[PDB]
């Protein structure tokens, strides 16, 4: 039986994979431009929320 | 690389001469002295003379001395 926990765990794993994906994209653009990147700006909270 | 941009520089010098207006053909060694090509090896110069100078359409050969063809371009 998949209760609230395991189901939410599956969703959260998917959304965290996403979050790291956009973090990688955002940081990669700045790194390619040669300028350092702001970690706080790299994070999209709306993904998980 | 080696021995290519020097040839390009010689050809550009010929265009500069033609913006100058000196129709009289010039000696290749004198051109080298003007363009600071003394350092380059002599064998490359000989290969240029035998092959590249004749292949270049703009270049012409008169009385054993190489210069542009005043007929090719419109006057």
């Amino acid at each position: 039986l998949d209760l609230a926990g395991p189901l939410l765990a599956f969703l959260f794993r998917g959304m965290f994979k996403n979050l790291l994906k956009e973090v990688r994209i955002y940081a990669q653009k700045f790194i390619d431009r040669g300028k350092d990147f702001n970690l706080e700006l790299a994070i999209k909270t709306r993904i998980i929320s | 690389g080696y021995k290519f941009g020097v040839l390009a520089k010689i050809v550009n010098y010929m265009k500069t001469r033609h913006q100058r207006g000196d129709t009289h053909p010039l000696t290749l060694d004198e051109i080298l002295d003007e363009t600071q090509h003394l350092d380059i090896g002599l064998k490359q110069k000989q290969w240029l003379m035998t092959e590249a100078l004749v292949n270049n359409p703009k270049i012409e050969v008169i009385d054993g001395k190489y210069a542009f063809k005043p007929k090719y371009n419109v006057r």
């Binding site: 990147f37 | 690389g1 290519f4």
Partner: protein, 88 residues
């Protein structure tokens, strides 16, 4: 403590400082630019404009003018149409 108010981001000020210190590329004389271009072509037969700009350290427009004067764009199977530094 997250997203604390700040006049300018540290990365942004560092990048701006680097840009200001480096300064814009200057338009050098045609003779010197041409000599550098010919030297580069000796090292490599085919050059992309983006890397050629880095090698020459000249404004893109000025370099494009000088390169249009002599070199010619060839449409090729390497990946795209690129400049050819050989005048002919």
């Amino acid at each position: 403590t997250n997203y604390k108010p700040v006049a300018n981001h540290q990365y942004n000020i560092e990048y701006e400082r680097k840009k200001k210190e480096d300064g814009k590329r200057a338009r050098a004389d045609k003779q010197h630019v041409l000599d550098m271009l010919f030297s580069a072509f000796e090292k490599h037969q085919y050059y992309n404009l983006k890397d050629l700009v880095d090698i020459t350290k000249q404004p893109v427009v000025y370099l494009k003018e000088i390169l249009k004067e002599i070199g010619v764009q060839n449409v090729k199977g390497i990946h795209k149409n690129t400049w050819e530094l050989k005048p002919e």
